[PDB]
Point group: D2
Chain length 279, copies 4
């Protein structure tokens, strides 16, 4: 006997778990995007301009921080997420600078990976010049069914957002390394340096000999604790998933931490970033 159904709000009532220890401390966590690194800004801006990108779809924009950078650099951006919880900060900022003309034109909407075609809006045009999905968000999507086919669908829908000749930019942490050291240490984000000091417990879940989940239990120092989970995408496999998603008719390369990656290199990157161009 719950007093209200799961997932239903009520006027003057916080939504179900808004108020808990874990929530309060996770918000402190997605509120540390106050230092975009210089190397990241110069590489994303450089890639999108080498390719003549003007219209960009930011998938899983979260708080909207990559997107605000884009809007400020003159791109025509539409930014979507499934999480209303995160989208609220994006929408706030647009509203604050609602009065800068670049931000008037900023499009922000709700979308889900699984229905991404129906959810995203597409102008007197059709087809985005580049679609970005960065910060290791794709890995947030679990393989609930078991065979990865939700990953297949999600990547098909993202794929289909990319116009002919356009780019998909999409990253994951280096799960090869993680599975093999058994750790996902903190302080490694190459997009935004934190200055929070954190401990992390790393839990690796292997089902029937295939890694299936990586779960990180954070302690941040005011001592507090939250948990986030990821699907451990191995490099070789993800590349394939992406290839399948454009049906082979594409050009693919791999960066490790913004730089070209050649298998065997001695530098072990924190992140792998895939840039595909639709042919």
């Amino acid at each position: 006997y719950r007093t209200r159904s799961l997932g239903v709000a009520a006027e003057g009532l916080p939504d179900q778990y808004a108020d808990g220890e874990a929530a309060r401390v996770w918000q402190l966590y997605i509120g540390d995007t106050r230092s975009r690194t210089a190397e990241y800004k110069a590489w994303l801006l450089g890639l999108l301009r080498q390719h003549g990108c003007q219209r960009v779809l930011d998938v899983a924009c979260g708080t909207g921080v990559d997107s605000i950078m884009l809007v400020e650099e003159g791109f025509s951006v539409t930014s979507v997420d499934a999480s209303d919880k995160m989208l609220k900060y994006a929408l706030k900022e647009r509203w604050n600078r609602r009065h800068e003309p670049a931000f008037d034109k900023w499009v922000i909407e709700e979308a889900n990976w699984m229905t991404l075609d129906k959810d995203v809006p597409q102008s007197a045009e059709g087809g985005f010049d580049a679609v970005i999905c960065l910060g290791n968000s794709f890995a947030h999507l679990p393989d609930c069914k078991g065979d990865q086919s939700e990953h297949r669908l999600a990547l098909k829908n993202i794929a289909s957002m990319v116009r002919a000749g356009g780019l998909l930019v999409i990253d994951h942490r280096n799960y090869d390394h993680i599975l093999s050291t058994g750790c996902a240490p903190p302080g490694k984000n190459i997009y935004y340096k934190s200055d929070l000091t954190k401990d992390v417990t790393t839990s690796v879940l292997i089902v029937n000999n295939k890694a299936h989940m990586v779960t990180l239990d954070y302690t941040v120092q005011g001592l507090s604790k939250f948990r986030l989970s990821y699907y451990p995408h191995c490099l070789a496999s993800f590349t394939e998933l992406l290839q399948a998603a454009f049906g082979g008719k594409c050009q693919h390369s791999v960066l490790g931490d913004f730089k070209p990656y050649k298998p065997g290199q001695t530098y072990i990157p924190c992140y792998f970033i895939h840039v595909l161009k639709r042919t």
Copy 2:
């Protein structure tokens, strides 16, 4: 072993229960308010202009529908709610008409009853409204009503000297005594959904303590709960909230209410003026 903590979102992941069969029927319920009755609009507009109210605080604005009416009628409105999931529709609409000047000036923020002083953004508000039976959403978790006392004190303190509080509650005198909260009885917004409602009364230690409605409305279920505030007792809660320096009257369904009258109202609305 949850895979993520309760209450923590993730890029490209629906928040925890956004997607359930209850949620997706409750957002049809939150969205069936497309017909503010003529009677209500003429009453609220009347009461606010009779008193010279200009700057208004809408507490628990939910989708912002009363507030949109106020913005359109030339009031200076700040509208708050605790629920981000309802506030999202208010924010959306402001954004869409962001281009009308009245809506540029519409202020919308998060606030919670228990910290209302710190949350809301000068020398008071002229009138503060809390209508649609929103106050009744607030449960008495502790047991002694000490959270309604605090909430009311915070709402109270939003009202400047000489200003108004308008605050309503469904007629729980009558519900408790028939054991039923029937649907179709909102005097503010006429639905055209047809619904069945199961009414559950929870009495703790001989005091009514909760009223829980299980709706059926494409057939499917959700549940909402309410604290059954009795008329005599609410009046007292409000009187305590201004410390007795106030004047109070009671409407039943927009009309003056005299105890004993034969017309049994669906809602009681208190209008208080701070002295």
Copy 3:
């Protein structure tokens, strides 16, 4: 991600909730029955011997304390319950006096009301007893009381031609109307624990539907729930269970009950004889 399914034990592991602060206070509650009142013993023994009952079925024997009395008094008793956790104490005691011949012959098995025919182990029982307000444990999950109908039919069918059913329920007429189930009022076993009880009444669609007692008794909490059976309605349930071929009378606290009497009883006991 539970680590083991709900309801599956494991060598050298306490079953799921055996160890909680509620459990370990409820087993103090199940164990405070060390004083069967003189009045009760003289009544039940009297009623069973008046009627010539020899072979008796104790339904919902719990710790087996009424049954132990019967074994000691020379009856041929089979005692069943659904709960393994309460049945464990019955079984223990039989084992300890396994060496007295009366206890060798004591039959103790698991059974559930809903399949009672298949579960209990010839040509009927002489009397079937269901005392201590155990029947009221059975909730009306479906909504229409169709599970009490089935249960009663199964209990009924345990009673041979010319035999008795003795079955009681607390006075829920009176509880519903004061809104309180006070403690200290068991007429079968006097506690000397001191307890506070919060009484919660749940009324669905104007029918009382559940009574939930939150006990406080070294201070700590547990909760038990009950279906509030009203006297007039229970009588009918029982009449339907024998198909009308039966005779029925009502005691209030071991004494004849005439509607209107000034003595308001704690318990109603039905004694029915199959014809």
Copy 4:
């Protein structure tokens, strides 16, 4: 709003989860102890008689099947478990043969590992001749705190049940092998052959690079599904845990599937069985 507290029964009511899909199918599972293997009976009986054991403590007797064998072979047995759910079948059988004199003397009680000293009863004597904990039950005990110290305590208490000169017989599946193939296949129990046909999903949980849990999700064929978890005890470590438990004053050896085990041997045993004698 639960209607009764977790863990409290009521007359004429099944206990909380007694009735579910999972329960109903797990009972089918511990009801397959109808074929003790010949090799096991001849080895346990032989070991206990080589050492002159007469008084035996069966820890985690579950349904009581090893114990009934012992009572029938003339041992003075006391059999304990924490699970009332399993103990119920042991108690049933004793009651049925209550009238055989060997079974009259059979002692059956509730005990928990963590309080095992206080819980078990000890005759006009003190100290059991041998204490057995077989069938991989010890592995049922989780490391909830994190540092294995519950294992330390539990093994101290079992240890302390063993009289001077007496034996502790205590086994675990071969978790070395399991962790390394990522599988715990079915059909491997060397004590009781099943004739149920089962599929198993094997899930390995590695926390901060130490294996922490092995969770088995069974499907049995009437198609039904239940889950059981285990702590993955590695051979080298368990031996140490046991050594620590007698404080070094003991004699230890290891069997693999009833036979002597020498590290490096080509036969990979399903189970490791430790026989320690207290000095």
